[PDB]
Amino acid sequence: TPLAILFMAAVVGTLVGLAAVAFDKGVAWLQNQRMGALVHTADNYPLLLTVAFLCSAVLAMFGYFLVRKYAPEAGGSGIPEIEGALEDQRPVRWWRVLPVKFFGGLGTLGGGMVLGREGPTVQIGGNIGRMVLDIFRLKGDEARHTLLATGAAAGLAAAFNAPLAGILFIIEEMRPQFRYTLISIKAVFIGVIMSTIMYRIFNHEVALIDVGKLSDAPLNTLWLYLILGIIFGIFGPIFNKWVLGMQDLLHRVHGGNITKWVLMGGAIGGLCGLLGFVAPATSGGGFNLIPIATAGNFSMGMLVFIFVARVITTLLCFSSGAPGGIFAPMLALGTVLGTAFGMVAVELFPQYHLEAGTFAIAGMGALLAASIRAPLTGIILVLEMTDNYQLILPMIITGLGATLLAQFTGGKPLYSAILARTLAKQEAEQ
Amino acid sequence: TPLAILFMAAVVGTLVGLAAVAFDKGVAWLQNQRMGALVHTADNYPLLLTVAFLCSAVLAMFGYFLVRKYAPEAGGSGIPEIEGALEDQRPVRWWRVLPVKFFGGLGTLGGGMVLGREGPTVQIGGNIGRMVLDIFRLKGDEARHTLLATGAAAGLAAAFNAPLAGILFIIEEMRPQFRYTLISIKAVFIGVIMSTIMYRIFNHEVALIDVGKLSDAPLNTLWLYLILGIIFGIFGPIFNKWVLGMQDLLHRVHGGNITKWVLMGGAIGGLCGLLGFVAPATSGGGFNLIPIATAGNFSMGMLVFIFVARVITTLLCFSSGAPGGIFAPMLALGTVLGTAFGMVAVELFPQYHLEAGTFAIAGMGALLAASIRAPLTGIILVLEMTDNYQLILPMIITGLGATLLAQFTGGKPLYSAILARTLAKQEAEQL
């Protein structure tokens, strides 16, 4: 028991790391095979349109048919039904939700949707941490929570190569009333470290969005980051309302009717699959359009069209009950709004010698701190994904001036809203 | 009021890191200026060994005369005083120790000594986090020990660029079964991540001391890393008793006698300067020979020579009370034994088709796992320093076997044995 739960945490770490890197490799393989089949025939334009449309719609409806038939809790980004599962409601079951998330989320994520590559694996981690817990028959009460939390943290630490954010996101989703034991936090630590080690064995790159060397921001332009924090704080609790107002709408237009729900899912996967070809910087995981939008490459007249198309696809494709989270779409939806304000700022203030590149890095985690209201795992997640650490002072300002002002306007966090809605729908069955 | 204690921990995390990179810039600048002064006048040997015994020895008398006149609790490895300060004893008075530990441990470590740059910055972290708590005059015993553990976890993470291994030493060097609040662990994390961010802001590096990607480790050769763990397990507590015995012998040969103590410190610094000049890899911070000894460069006789010489000089120049910590040179003293075991293995089993590099990495976090008895921060520290993550299973096998044999035969961790010895000694001196 004492020095065995640490070995259990090590098994959780290596299994979640291997599953996350296999999920990433399968998604990359499906995307590369899809674009290879696109280049394989190059005769005319509408045939290429329909072969990019019907494919990745069949691949999306495969994932939709697998989720809406076998396990209904896999739809909805994974962090709901693991935050409640950290409590004693909405339980997890690896015999149902673990295979469907992997083998029907890799298809609908690598097909070309605008879904996230963190949401599936952050629930894959918790379900593995429950699976290898219960298959050893290690009975307990706190042991279940400290073998579920290490999986729920490892599923992010092996997802974004960020252990310092992978532990902080599972810290900032707890209750500070009761204090915790030293064996539990060590069981989280060992699982996080084994998962990021099993991630770093396969892949070697220490960055994830290679923007590279940038310019520092002096103290004369520091207040514009606080102004951008005010913009992100007044934009924070509106996107959550848009998600929660599109979710009941997409459920209303296809109430019940699984064989119609998967046709709606195919029709919404084919749209973003076509948009991945006709104009590729509006759909996908976002990492194909973040380093293009950090440096100045997008025009101002095209940037608002990119932002509007981006929000209208990341509302309408995720919220229909799809296997994907909001860490990968939001980290591009924030940086587009960041580089727009950066272009306006460099056009407005010539006496600062500033560029819009640092304003794009200083707006990635701003939306992640204004919507999820977790401002300590946005900043370090950004500074571990991209590597320009030098804008740490114009990142904490636009984080804690965004969430502090969004607290005053009134708005619940997103994962404490989807979980609240499904907790109402749990007791509202009879 | 907690948000304020989180901002307090942010002040600790931004002061440490800056202080650690200032310490690193100072020790590198002093070593570079000594290397430049050795080649300015480069006529012959006897007019250069005398200046190598003059400088990097007056720089040792400087640190010794600092640490013996102003604050005597700053002398020796740093971190056992922080281990005492995490309990309700050994008061870390920052006005006495922070103007002496930095300004003497940059000198006695830029003097080419055998010591390491982890101890004198983990105590700098703890003393900074104890300084900022009284300068804001917000009291509380649970409001304290969250700015002391914050600095003690900040110092190591800014020393070795290891924000993962910087927390787990504080995890594994605290009391078990004691429940800790979420505000405390968040105040630890804020200091850790600020202390690695404002470390990596200056010296842009992908890692610390590097070999590159070595070979992989197949499943057939895991039966030999356990034997290496057996060797480090029977070596560890003997090394810890060697440290304590050399400390007792040096205090026997110098009881009090501050002028003779700083003269012995000058002689013991000039010794390191001379042996560092005549041989490029037998002294230093244990970082200038780990890439040399990991790849195949040395012969086996030269390897046992550098191992015996470093075993001599680590005990001989650490237990004299100089401001330096044995947490960096233990890595080099372990990896010379690891590459010696690899040199035995490439001759005894040539059909395994392995080289001595994959056994030179698994000796770094083995002596640090045996003589310190914290294996889950010696497994991760090596993988954070050298970026060859592809051997995690041999490091786990070697570390677990080393701590298993070190616990079976017996012995105490060094950073707790030194603390227990000085806690007995101070009450033996008083009353």
Side-chain angles (χ1 to χ4, degrees), chain B residues 199-255:
Chain B
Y199 178 74
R200 290 149 149 178
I201 192 180
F202 294 115
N203 41 5
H204 301 75
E205 212 61 46
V206 78
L208 200 59
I209 43 156
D210 71 310
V211 203
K213 188 210 300 177
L214 271 163
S215 49
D216 307 66
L219 67 93
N220 193 278
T221 176
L222 285 179
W223 83 281
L224 216 61
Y225 292 88
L226 193 45
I227 301 304
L228 176 58
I230 292 283
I231 295 307
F232 268 111
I234 54 174
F235 181 70
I238 311 191
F239 187 82
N240 267 6
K241 291 175 190 174
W242 277 345
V243 177
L244 272 74
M246 194 72 61
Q247 180 161 341
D248 176 277
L249 196 139
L250 286 158
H251 191 70
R252 166 190 95 100
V253 80
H254 278 77

Short mmCIF file of all heavy atoms in Angstrom, two decimals, chain B residues 199-255:
data_model
loop_
_atom_site.label_atom_id
_atom_site.label_comp_id
_atom_site.label_asym_id
_atom_site.label_seq_id
_atom_site.Cartn_x
_atom_site.Cartn_y
_atom_site.Cartn_z
N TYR B 199 14.75 32.07 -14.72
CA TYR B 199 16.04 31.49 -15.06
C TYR B 199 16.20 31.39 -16.57
O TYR B 199 17.18 31.87 -17.13
CB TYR B 199 16.22 30.11 -14.41
CG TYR B 199 17.54 29.45 -14.78
CD1 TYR B 199 18.73 29.89 -14.22
CD2 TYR B 199 17.58 28.40 -15.69
CE1 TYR B 199 19.94 29.29 -14.56
CE2 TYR B 199 18.78 27.81 -16.04
CZ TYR B 199 19.95 28.25 -15.47
OH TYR B 199 21.14 27.66 -15.80
N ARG B 200 15.22 30.77 -17.24
CA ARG B 200 15.29 30.56 -18.68
C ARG B 200 15.14 31.84 -19.50
O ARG B 200 15.30 31.79 -20.72
CB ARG B 200 14.21 29.58 -19.13
CG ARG B 200 14.43 28.15 -18.69
CD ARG B 200 13.10 27.45 -18.47
NE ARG B 200 13.16 26.02 -18.75
CZ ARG B 200 12.13 25.19 -18.59
NH1 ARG B 200 10.97 25.65 -18.16
NH2 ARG B 200 12.27 23.90 -18.87
N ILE B 201 14.83 32.98 -18.87
CA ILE B 201 14.72 34.23 -19.62
C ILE B 201 16.09 34.72 -20.10
O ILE B 201 16.18 35.36 -21.16
CB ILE B 201 13.97 35.28 -18.77
CG1 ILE B 201 13.58 36.50 -19.61
CG2 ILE B 201 14.79 35.74 -17.58
CD1 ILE B 201 12.83 37.56 -18.83
N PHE B 202 17.17 34.39 -19.39
CA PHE B 202 18.49 34.92 -19.74
C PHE B 202 19.31 33.96 -20.60
O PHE B 202 19.65 34.28 -21.74
CB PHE B 202 19.26 35.30 -18.48
CG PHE B 202 18.65 36.43 -17.72
CD1 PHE B 202 18.14 36.23 -16.45
CD2 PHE B 202 18.60 37.70 -18.27
CE1 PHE B 202 17.57 37.28 -15.74
CE2 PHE B 202 18.03 38.75 -17.57
CZ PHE B 202 17.52 38.54 -16.31
N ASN B 203 19.62 32.78 -20.07
CA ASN B 203 20.47 31.82 -20.77
C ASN B 203 19.57 30.83 -21.51
O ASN B 203 19.13 29.82 -20.96
CB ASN B 203 21.44 31.12 -19.81
CG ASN B 203 20.79 30.76 -18.50
OD1 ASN B 203 19.59 30.93 -18.31
ND2 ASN B 203 21.59 30.26 -17.56
N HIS B 204 19.29 31.15 -22.77
CA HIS B 204 18.43 30.33 -23.62
C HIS B 204 19.16 29.04 -23.95
O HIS B 204 20.09 29.02 -24.76
CB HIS B 204 18.05 31.09 -24.89
CG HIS B 204 17.33 32.38 -24.63
ND1 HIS B 204 17.97 33.51 -24.19
CD2 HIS B 204 16.03 32.71 -24.77
CE1 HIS B 204 17.09 34.49 -24.06
NE2 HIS B 204 15.90 34.03 -24.41
N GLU B 205 18.74 27.94 -23.32
CA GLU B 205 19.33 26.64 -23.56
C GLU B 205 18.22 25.60 -23.58
O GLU B 205 17.22 25.72 -22.87
CB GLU B 205 20.37 26.28 -22.51
CG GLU B 205 21.51 25.41 -23.03
CD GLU B 205 22.29 26.08 -24.14
OE1 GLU B 205 22.64 27.27 -23.99
OE2 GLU B 205 22.54 25.43 -25.17
N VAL B 206 18.41 24.57 -24.41
CA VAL B 206 17.42 23.50 -24.50
C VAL B 206 17.48 22.58 -23.29
O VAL B 206 16.50 21.90 -22.97
CB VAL B 206 17.60 22.74 -25.83
CG1 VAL B 206 18.78 21.76 -25.78
CG2 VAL B 206 16.32 22.03 -26.25
N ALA B 207 18.60 22.58 -22.57
CA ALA B 207 18.84 21.67 -21.46
C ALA B 207 19.95 22.26 -20.59
O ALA B 207 20.25 23.46 -20.68
CB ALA B 207 19.18 20.26 -21.98
N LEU B 208 20.53 21.42 -19.74
CA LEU B 208 21.76 21.65 -19.02
C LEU B 208 22.73 20.63 -19.62
O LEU B 208 22.47 20.12 -20.72
CB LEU B 208 21.51 21.53 -17.51
CG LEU B 208 22.50 22.16 -16.52
CD1 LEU B 208 22.60 23.65 -16.77
CD2 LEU B 208 22.06 21.90 -15.10
N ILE B 209 23.87 20.38 -18.93
CA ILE B 209 25.08 19.69 -19.41
C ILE B 209 24.79 18.46 -20.27
O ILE B 209 24.04 17.56 -19.87
CB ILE B 209 25.97 19.30 -18.22
CG1 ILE B 209 25.12 18.73 -17.07
CG2 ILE B 209 26.78 20.49 -17.75
CD1 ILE B 209 25.88 17.83 -16.14
N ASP B 210 25.37 18.43 -21.47
CA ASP B 210 24.80 17.68 -22.58
C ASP B 210 25.75 16.61 -23.08
O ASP B 210 26.97 16.78 -23.08
CB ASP B 210 24.42 18.62 -23.73
CG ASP B 210 25.63 19.19 -24.45
OD1 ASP B 210 26.54 19.72 -23.77
OD2 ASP B 210 25.68 19.10 -25.69
N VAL B 211 25.17 15.48 -23.48
CA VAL B 211 25.86 14.48 -24.27
C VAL B 211 25.23 14.35 -25.66
O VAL B 211 25.91 13.89 -26.59
CB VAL B 211 25.87 13.11 -23.56
CG1 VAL B 211 27.02 12.23 -24.06
CG2 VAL B 211 25.94 13.28 -22.05
N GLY B 212 23.99 14.79 -25.84
CA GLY B 212 23.22 14.44 -27.01
C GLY B 212 22.48 13.15 -26.78
O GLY B 212 22.52 12.54 -25.70
N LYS B 213 21.76 12.72 -27.81
CA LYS B 213 21.03 11.46 -27.72
C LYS B 213 22.01 10.30 -27.81
O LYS B 213 22.68 10.11 -28.83
CB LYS B 213 19.98 11.36 -28.82
CG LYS B 213 19.07 10.16 -28.67
CD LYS B 213 18.57 9.65 -30.01
CE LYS B 213 17.78 10.71 -30.75
NZ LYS B 213 17.35 10.25 -32.10
N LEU B 214 22.09 9.51 -26.73
CA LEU B 214 22.90 8.30 -26.72
C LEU B 214 22.09 7.16 -27.33
O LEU B 214 21.04 7.36 -27.94
CB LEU B 214 23.36 7.99 -25.30
CG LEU B 214 24.68 8.63 -24.88
CD1 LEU B 214 24.83 8.62 -23.37
CD2 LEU B 214 25.84 7.92 -25.54
N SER B 215 22.59 5.93 -27.18
CA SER B 215 21.87 4.79 -27.71
C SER B 215 20.67 4.46 -26.82
O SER B 215 20.55 4.94 -25.69
CB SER B 215 22.78 3.57 -27.81
OG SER B 215 23.48 3.37 -26.60
N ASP B 216 19.79 3.63 -27.35
CA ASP B 216 18.68 3.13 -26.56
C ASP B 216 19.15 1.99 -25.65
O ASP B 216 20.30 1.56 -25.70
CB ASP B 216 17.54 2.66 -27.46
CG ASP B 216 17.12 3.72 -28.46
OD1 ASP B 216 17.94 4.07 -29.34
OD2 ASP B 216 15.98 4.21 -28.37
N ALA B 217 18.24 1.51 -24.82
CA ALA B 217 18.54 0.42 -23.90
C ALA B 217 17.61 -0.75 -24.17
O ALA B 217 16.40 -0.64 -23.89
CB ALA B 217 18.42 0.88 -22.45
N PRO B 218 18.10 -1.86 -24.71
CA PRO B 218 17.23 -3.01 -24.97
C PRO B 218 16.84 -3.72 -23.69
O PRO B 218 17.39 -3.49 -22.61
CB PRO B 218 18.07 -3.91 -25.88
CG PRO B 218 19.48 -3.52 -25.59
CD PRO B 218 19.46 -2.06 -25.24
N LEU B 219 15.86 -4.61 -23.82
CA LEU B 219 15.30 -5.33 -22.68
C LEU B 219 16.21 -6.45 -22.18
O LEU B 219 15.96 -6.98 -21.09
CB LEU B 219 13.91 -5.87 -23.04
CG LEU B 219 13.71 -6.97 -24.10
CD1 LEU B 219 13.69 -8.39 -23.53
CD2 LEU B 219 12.45 -6.69 -24.90
N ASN B 220 17.23 -6.83 -22.95
CA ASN B 220 18.09 -7.93 -22.54
C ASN B 220 19.13 -7.49 -21.52
O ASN B 220 19.56 -8.30 -20.69
CB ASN B 220 18.78 -8.53 -23.77
CG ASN B 220 19.44 -9.86 -23.47
OD1 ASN B 220 20.56 -9.91 -22.96
ND2 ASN B 220 18.75 -10.95 -23.78
N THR B 221 19.55 -6.23 -21.55
CA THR B 221 20.67 -5.75 -20.75
C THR B 221 20.24 -5.11 -19.44
O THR B 221 21.04 -4.42 -18.81
CB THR B 221 21.51 -4.77 -21.56
OG1 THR B 221 22.56 -4.25 -20.73
CG2 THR B 221 20.66 -3.62 -22.04
N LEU B 222 18.99 -5.32 -19.02
CA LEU B 222 18.54 -4.74 -17.76
C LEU B 222 19.06 -5.49 -16.54
O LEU B 222 18.89 -4.99 -15.42
CB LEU B 222 17.01 -4.69 -17.72
CG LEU B 222 16.37 -3.61 -18.58
CD1 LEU B 222 14.86 -3.67 -18.48
CD2 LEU B 222 16.87 -2.24 -18.17
N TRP B 223 19.68 -6.65 -16.72
CA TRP B 223 20.22 -7.42 -15.60
C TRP B 223 21.55 -6.88 -15.09
O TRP B 223 22.03 -7.35 -14.06
CB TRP B 223 20.39 -8.89 -16.00
CG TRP B 223 21.66 -9.17 -16.73
CD1 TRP B 223 21.93 -8.92 -18.05
CD2 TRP B 223 22.85 -9.76 -16.19
NE1 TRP B 223 23.20 -9.32 -18.36
CE2 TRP B 223 23.79 -9.84 -17.24
CE3 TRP B 223 23.21 -10.24 -14.93
CZ2 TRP B 223 25.06 -10.37 -17.06
CZ3 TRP B 223 24.47 -10.77 -14.75
CH2 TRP B 223 25.39 -10.83 -15.81
N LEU B 224 22.15 -5.90 -15.77
CA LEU B 224 23.42 -5.33 -15.36
C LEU B 224 23.27 -4.00 -14.64
O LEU B 224 24.10 -3.65 -13.79
CB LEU B 224 24.33 -5.15 -16.58
CG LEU B 224 25.82 -5.39 -16.36
CD1 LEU B 224 26.06 -6.81 -15.91
CD2 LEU B 224 26.56 -5.11 -17.64
N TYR B 225 22.20 -3.25 -14.95
CA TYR B 225 21.93 -2.01 -14.24
C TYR B 225 21.55 -2.28 -12.79
O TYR B 225 21.84 -1.45 -11.92
CB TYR B 225 20.82 -1.24 -14.95
CG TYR B 225 21.22 -0.69 -16.30
CD1 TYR B 225 21.08 -1.46 -17.44
CD2 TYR B 225 21.74 0.58 -16.42
CE1 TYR B 225 21.45 -0.97 -18.67
CE2 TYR B 225 22.11 1.09 -17.65
CZ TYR B 225 21.96 0.30 -18.77
OH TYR B 225 22.32 0.79 -20.00
N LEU B 226 20.94 -3.43 -12.52
CA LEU B 226 20.71 -3.83 -11.13
C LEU B 226 22.01 -4.10 -10.40
O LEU B 226 22.13 -3.78 -9.22
CB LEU B 226 19.79 -5.05 -11.08
CG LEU B 226 19.20 -5.41 -9.72
CD1 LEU B 226 18.66 -4.17 -9.00
CD2 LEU B 226 18.11 -6.45 -9.87
N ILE B 227 23.01 -4.65 -11.09
CA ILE B 227 24.32 -4.89 -10.47
C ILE B 227 25.02 -3.56 -10.20
O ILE B 227 25.68 -3.39 -9.17
CB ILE B 227 25.16 -5.81 -11.37
CG1 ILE B 227 24.44 -7.15 -11.58
CG2 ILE B 227 26.52 -6.08 -10.76
CD1 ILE B 227 24.10 -7.87 -10.29
N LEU B 228 24.86 -2.59 -11.11
CA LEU B 228 25.38 -1.24 -10.87
C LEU B 228 24.68 -0.59 -9.68
O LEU B 228 25.31 0.12 -8.88
CB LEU B 228 25.22 -0.39 -12.13
CG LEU B 228 25.61 1.08 -12.02
CD1 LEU B 228 27.06 1.22 -11.60
CD2 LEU B 228 25.36 1.79 -13.34
N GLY B 229 23.37 -0.84 -9.53
CA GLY B 229 22.66 -0.37 -8.35
C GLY B 229 23.14 -1.03 -7.07
O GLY B 229 23.19 -0.39 -6.02
N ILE B 230 23.51 -2.32 -7.15
CA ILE B 230 24.11 -3.02 -6.01
C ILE B 230 25.43 -2.36 -5.61
O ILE B 230 25.70 -2.14 -4.42
CB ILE B 230 24.30 -4.51 -6.35
CG1 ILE B 230 22.95 -5.23 -6.49
CG2 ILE B 230 25.21 -5.22 -5.35
CD1 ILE B 230 22.26 -5.56 -5.19
N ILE B 231 26.25 -2.00 -6.61
CA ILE B 231 27.54 -1.38 -6.34
C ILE B 231 27.37 0.00 -5.70
O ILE B 231 28.03 0.34 -4.71
CB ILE B 231 28.37 -1.31 -7.63
CG1 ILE B 231 28.72 -2.71 -8.12
CG2 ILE B 231 29.64 -0.50 -7.43
CD1 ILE B 231 29.40 -3.58 -7.08
N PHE B 232 26.43 0.80 -6.22
CA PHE B 232 26.20 2.11 -5.63
C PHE B 232 25.53 2.01 -4.26
O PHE B 232 25.76 2.87 -3.40
CB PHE B 232 25.37 2.98 -6.57
CG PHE B 232 26.20 3.82 -7.49
CD1 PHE B 232 26.24 3.56 -8.84
CD2 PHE B 232 26.97 4.85 -6.98
CE1 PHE B 232 27.01 4.33 -9.68
CE2 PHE B 232 27.74 5.63 -7.81
CZ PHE B 232 27.76 5.37 -9.17
N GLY B 233 24.75 0.96 -4.03
CA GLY B 233 24.14 0.77 -2.73
C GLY B 233 25.15 0.39 -1.66
O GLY B 233 25.06 0.85 -0.52
N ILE B 234 26.14 -0.44 -2.01
CA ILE B 234 27.19 -0.70 -1.03
C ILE B 234 28.20 0.43 -0.96
O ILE B 234 29.00 0.47 -0.01
CB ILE B 234 27.92 -2.03 -1.26
CG1 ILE B 234 28.47 -2.14 -2.68
CG2 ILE B 234 27.03 -3.22 -0.92
CD1 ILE B 234 29.34 -3.36 -2.90
N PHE B 235 28.21 1.36 -1.92
CA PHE B 235 29.14 2.48 -1.83
C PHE B 235 28.58 3.69 -1.08
O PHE B 235 29.36 4.40 -0.43
CB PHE B 235 29.56 2.92 -3.24
CG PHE B 235 30.54 4.05 -3.24
CD1 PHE B 235 31.84 3.87 -2.81
CD2 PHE B 235 30.16 5.31 -3.68
CE1 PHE B 235 32.75 4.91 -2.81
CE2 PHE B 235 31.06 6.36 -3.68
CZ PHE B 235 32.35 6.16 -3.25
N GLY B 236 27.27 3.93 -1.14
CA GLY B 236 26.64 5.13 -0.62
C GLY B 236 26.85 5.52 0.84
O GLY B 236 27.38 6.60 1.13
N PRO B 237 26.39 4.68 1.78
CA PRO B 237 26.56 5.04 3.20
C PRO B 237 28.00 5.09 3.66
O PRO B 237 28.31 5.82 4.61
CB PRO B 237 25.77 3.94 3.93
CG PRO B 237 25.71 2.82 2.96
CD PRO B 237 25.56 3.48 1.63
N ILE B 238 28.90 4.35 3.00
CA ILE B 238 30.33 4.49 3.26
C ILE B 238 30.80 5.89 2.87
O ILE B 238 31.60 6.51 3.57
CB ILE B 238 31.11 3.40 2.51
CG1 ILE B 238 30.49 2.03 2.78
CG2 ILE B 238 32.58 3.42 2.92
CD1 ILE B 238 31.32 0.85 2.32
N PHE B 239 30.26 6.42 1.77
CA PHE B 239 30.60 7.79 1.36
C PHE B 239 30.04 8.81 2.34
O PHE B 239 30.70 9.81 2.64
CB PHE B 239 30.08 8.05 -0.06
CG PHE B 239 30.51 9.36 -0.63
CD1 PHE B 239 31.76 9.50 -1.21
CD2 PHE B 239 29.66 10.46 -0.63
CE1 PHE B 239 32.16 10.71 -1.75
CE2 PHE B 239 30.05 11.67 -1.16
CZ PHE B 239 31.31 11.79 -1.72
N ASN B 240 28.83 8.57 2.87
CA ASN B 240 28.26 9.50 3.85
C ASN B 240 29.06 9.49 5.16
O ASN B 240 29.32 10.56 5.74
CB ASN B 240 26.80 9.15 4.11
CG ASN B 240 25.85 9.92 3.22
OD1 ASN B 240 26.28 10.65 2.32
ND2 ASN B 240 24.55 9.78 3.46
N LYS B 241 29.47 8.31 5.61
CA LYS B 241 30.32 8.22 6.79
C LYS B 241 31.70 8.81 6.52
O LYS B 241 32.33 9.34 7.45
CB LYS B 241 30.44 6.77 7.24
CG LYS B 241 29.15 6.20 7.82
CD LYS B 241 29.29 4.73 8.15
CE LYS B 241 27.94 4.12 8.50
NZ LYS B 241 28.02 2.65 8.70
N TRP B 242 32.17 8.77 5.27
CA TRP B 242 33.42 9.44 4.91
C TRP B 242 33.29 10.95 5.02
O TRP B 242 34.21 11.63 5.48
CB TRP B 242 33.83 9.04 3.50
CG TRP B 242 34.56 7.74 3.41
CD1 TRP B 242 35.12 7.05 4.44
CD2 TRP B 242 34.81 6.98 2.23
NE1 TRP B 242 35.71 5.90 3.97
CE2 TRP B 242 35.52 5.83 2.62
CE3 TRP B 242 34.49 7.15 0.88
CZ2 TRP B 242 35.93 4.86 1.70
CZ3 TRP B 242 34.89 6.19 -0.02
CH2 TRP B 242 35.60 5.06 0.39
N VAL B 243 32.14 11.50 4.59
CA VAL B 243 31.88 12.94 4.73
C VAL B 243 31.88 13.35 6.20
O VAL B 243 32.57 14.31 6.59
CB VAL B 243 30.56 13.33 4.05
CG1 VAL B 243 30.27 14.80 4.27
CG2 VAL B 243 30.60 13.06 2.57
N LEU B 244 31.14 12.62 7.04
CA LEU B 244 31.07 12.97 8.46
C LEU B 244 32.41 12.77 9.17
O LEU B 244 32.79 13.57 10.03
CB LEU B 244 29.97 12.19 9.16
CG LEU B 244 28.55 12.79 9.16
CD1 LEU B 244 27.85 12.67 7.82
CD2 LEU B 244 27.71 12.16 10.26
N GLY B 245 33.16 11.73 8.79
CA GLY B 245 34.46 11.51 9.39
C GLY B 245 35.49 12.55 8.98
O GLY B 245 36.32 12.95 9.80
N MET B 246 35.45 13.01 7.73
CA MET B 246 36.36 14.06 7.31
C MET B 246 35.99 15.39 7.97
O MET B 246 36.88 16.18 8.30
CB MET B 246 36.36 14.20 5.79
CG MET B 246 37.50 15.03 5.25
SD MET B 246 39.09 14.18 5.35
CE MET B 246 38.76 12.74 4.33
N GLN B 247 34.70 15.63 8.20
CA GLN B 247 34.29 16.82 8.94
C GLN B 247 34.77 16.77 10.38
O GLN B 247 35.27 17.78 10.91
CB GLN B 247 32.77 16.97 8.89
CG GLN B 247 32.24 18.18 9.63
CD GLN B 247 30.84 18.57 9.19
OE1 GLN B 247 30.37 18.16 8.12
NE2 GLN B 247 30.15 19.35 10.02
N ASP B 248 34.68 15.60 11.02
CA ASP B 248 35.16 15.45 12.39
C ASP B 248 36.68 15.59 12.45
O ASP B 248 37.21 16.19 13.40
CB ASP B 248 34.70 14.11 12.96
CG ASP B 248 35.23 13.83 14.36
OD1 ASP B 248 36.38 13.35 14.49
OD2 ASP B 248 34.48 14.04 15.33
N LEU B 249 37.39 15.08 11.45
CA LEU B 249 38.85 15.17 11.43
C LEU B 249 39.31 16.61 11.20
O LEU B 249 40.28 17.06 11.82
CB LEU B 249 39.42 14.24 10.36
CG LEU B 249 40.91 13.90 10.42
CD1 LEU B 249 41.11 12.43 10.10
CD2 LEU B 249 41.72 14.75 9.45
N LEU B 250 38.61 17.35 10.34
CA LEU B 250 38.98 18.74 10.10
C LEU B 250 38.63 19.63 11.28
O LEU B 250 39.36 20.59 11.57
CB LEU B 250 38.33 19.24 8.82
CG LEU B 250 38.98 18.68 7.56
CD1 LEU B 250 38.04 18.75 6.38
CD2 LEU B 250 40.28 19.42 7.27
N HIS B 251 37.55 19.33 12.00
CA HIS B 251 37.28 20.09 13.22
C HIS B 251 38.20 19.68 14.37
O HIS B 251 38.43 20.49 15.27
CB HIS B 251 35.82 19.93 13.65
CG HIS B 251 35.41 20.88 14.73
ND1 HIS B 251 35.27 22.23 14.52
CD2 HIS B 251 35.12 20.67 16.03
CE1 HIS B 251 34.91 22.82 15.64
NE2 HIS B 251 34.81 21.89 16.58
N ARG B 252 38.73 18.46 14.35
CA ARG B 252 39.74 18.07 15.33
C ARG B 252 41.06 18.80 15.06
O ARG B 252 41.69 19.32 15.99
CB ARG B 252 39.95 16.56 15.30
CG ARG B 252 41.19 16.07 16.02
CD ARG B 252 41.46 14.60 15.73
NE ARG B 252 42.39 14.42 14.63
CZ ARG B 252 43.68 14.15 14.78
NH1 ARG B 252 44.20 14.03 16.00
NH2 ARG B 252 44.46 14.00 13.72
N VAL B 253 41.48 18.86 13.80
CA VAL B 253 42.73 19.54 13.47
C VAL B 253 42.56 21.06 13.51
O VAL B 253 43.56 21.78 13.60
CB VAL B 253 43.26 19.05 12.11
CG1 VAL B 253 42.53 19.71 10.95
CG2 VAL B 253 44.77 19.22 12.00
N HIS B 254 41.33 21.58 13.47
CA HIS B 254 41.08 23.01 13.63
C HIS B 254 39.84 23.20 14.50
O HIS B 254 38.72 23.24 13.99
CB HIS B 254 40.93 23.69 12.27
CG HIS B 254 42.23 24.03 11.62
ND1 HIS B 254 43.02 23.08 11.00
CD2 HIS B 254 42.89 25.21 11.49
CE1 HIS B 254 44.10 23.66 10.51
NE2 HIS B 254 44.05 24.95 10.80
N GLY B 255 40.06 23.31 15.80
CA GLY B 255 38.99 23.64 16.72
C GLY B 255 39.02 25.12 17.06
O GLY B 255 39.93 25.57 17.77
#
